[PDB]
Amino acid sequence: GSSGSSGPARFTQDLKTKEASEGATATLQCELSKVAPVEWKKGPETLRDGGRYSLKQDGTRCELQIHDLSVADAGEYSCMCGQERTSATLTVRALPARFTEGSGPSSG
């Protein structure tokens, strides 16, 4: 086919996310047509590596991380790469209101 020809990188594998609990750390994975600089986004605003966000680029793949997860973080993370773009709704489980008491083992 056609390979030897300059051009922008386009997503190949729809970006996906995982479901973690509050305080935990999420991990999103996404593939690309080729090694190209992308930019993660959490809405009408732009994000960046450093602070409370970790974005690693493994060749044609990008692994995003969100330390200290939260119920307010659960939204829609979009990633812009060249001309194409994708998004994935992150799942954040809210902590349990109360801590189950449990039960005691019966006796003979």
Count of other CB atoms within 10 angstroms of residue 93: 13
CB 75 within 8 A of CB 69: no
User: What gap in Å lies between CA 36 and CA 28, rounded to an integer?
Assistant: 17
Contact assessment for residue 33 and residue 12, using Cβ atoms and an 8 Å cutoff: yes
Report residue 15 as tokens: 């970006």
- In whole angstroms, give the CA distance from residue 37 to residue 81: 7
Burial of 51 by CB count in 10 Å (0-12 exposed, 13-18 middle, 19+ buried)? exposed
How far is residue 73's CA from residue 4's CA, in Å, rounded to a whole number? 41
Task: Please give the full DSSP string across 19-56, using - where no structure is assigned.
Answer: EEETTS-EEEEEEBSSS---EEESSSSB--SSSS-EEE
**Count of CB atoms situated within 10 Å of the CB of 82:** 16
- Fill in the amino acid letter for 104: G
**Cα-trace Rg, the chain:** 19
User: How far from chain centre, in Å, is Cα 81?
Assistant: 15
Task: Using alpha carbons, select from 84, 78, 77, 76 the residue that is nearest to residue 34.
Answer: 84
Structure solved via: NMR
Compute the distance between CA of residue 76 and CA of residue 55 in angstroms, rounded to an integer.
Answer: 16
Q: Which domains does the chain have, with CATH numbers?
A: 8-95 (2.60.40.10)
